[PDB]
Amino acid sequence: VIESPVDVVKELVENSLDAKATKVEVEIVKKRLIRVKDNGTGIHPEDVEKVVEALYSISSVSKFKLRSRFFQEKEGKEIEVEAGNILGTRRVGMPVGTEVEVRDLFFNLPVRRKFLKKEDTERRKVLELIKEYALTNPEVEFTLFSEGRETLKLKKSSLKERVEEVFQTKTEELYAEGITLRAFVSRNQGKYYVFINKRPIQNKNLKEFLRKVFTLVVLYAELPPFLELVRELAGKEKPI
Ligand SMILES: Nc1ncnc2c1ncn2[C@@H]1O[C@H](COP(=O)(O)OP(=O)(O)O)[C@@H](O)[C@H]1O
């Protein structure tokens, strides 16, 4: 579950969205620090200690803090853990929501730490991950700071606006329908994103076929628990 900083960011941002955050803020350093802040419902003080599953596995491999203020409470609570060992808790003043800081990832596993990829490779994986969450959560604001610079800022918007902000280009929206397809295509620019029932799909069979029938292609597929309709979809661009 936890091999590198991107895996940490994934689990934390998933937890923020699970807690119906509308603003998710991520900061990474070098790794050295992963911080995820959200304005979701928070965690009751009586449950903060319990959560140390994904947070257990993260806290046992880092110098870990989690602070959270429950929507019903005036104060937050903070728990601090090192490599799975609880170091203490504290009352803290904070806004409603949750902030998790993961420091010195794999400090307790120096071989695993020395085999991590260079900072710039880890950075790009976290950048791509946050783009992927932003593409399926257009109602959510996302910010990413890396090495102290605000490298990604996406405000709440329509899906088409959110696609266009992410990829910095104008798109044409295509549609074809128990099976539903919605794509956004931009032709000059090649990148082929696929979301099946709101989840990111990396399948090679699908990206090659999007390459073959289209270019930037962002495909949102909704299916009950195909490639024909995609090529049917590819013919639906307006004449000009
Ligand atoms: N950002 C957050 N906001 C609210 N609750 C959180 C947050 N992060 C974690 N939690 C709480 O901690 C629990 C454990 O998180 P986790 O270890 O990721 O397991 P899981 O999310 O699969 O239940 C969650 O069920 C949720 O109750």
Ligand SMILES: [Mg+2]
């Ligand atoms: Mg979780």
